[PDB]
Design a protein around this nucleic acid. Sequence first.
DNA 1: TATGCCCAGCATCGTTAATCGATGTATATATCTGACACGTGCCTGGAGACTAGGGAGTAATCCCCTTGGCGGTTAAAACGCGGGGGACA
Length: 51
Amino acid sequence: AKTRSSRAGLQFPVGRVHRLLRKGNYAERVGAGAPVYLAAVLEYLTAEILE
DNA sequence: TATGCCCAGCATCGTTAATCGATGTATATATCTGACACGTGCCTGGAGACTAGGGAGTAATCCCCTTGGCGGTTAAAACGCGGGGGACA
């Protein structure tokens, strides 16, 4: 698969959330599966609420 | 001439049948709006690939801090008793 989201099996945007973690000054280095983890998390929450 | 008798004459009641119209019920067609999927076009904000560097991992040593044990006084917790004054109706 090309799309990252799909390599991690998800609907949430892997790379759009990565950049948002660099345009928010939150820190000097951005982690590699953080982004995903985080995307996926919210994903659940949304669901949880949206369910 | 007046009084019972013959011959029409429309409205009284009821019943039958045809007709215009309303109500109920399909049945295939022509709008209405609200789309969600696709292709149109374009931006680049992500992906992809490579590099370089310094953070963070780990490992090896140190030594400070935290836990422990103990026993003596000495205040504190514990108890009760009693009755007043605040809660509650």
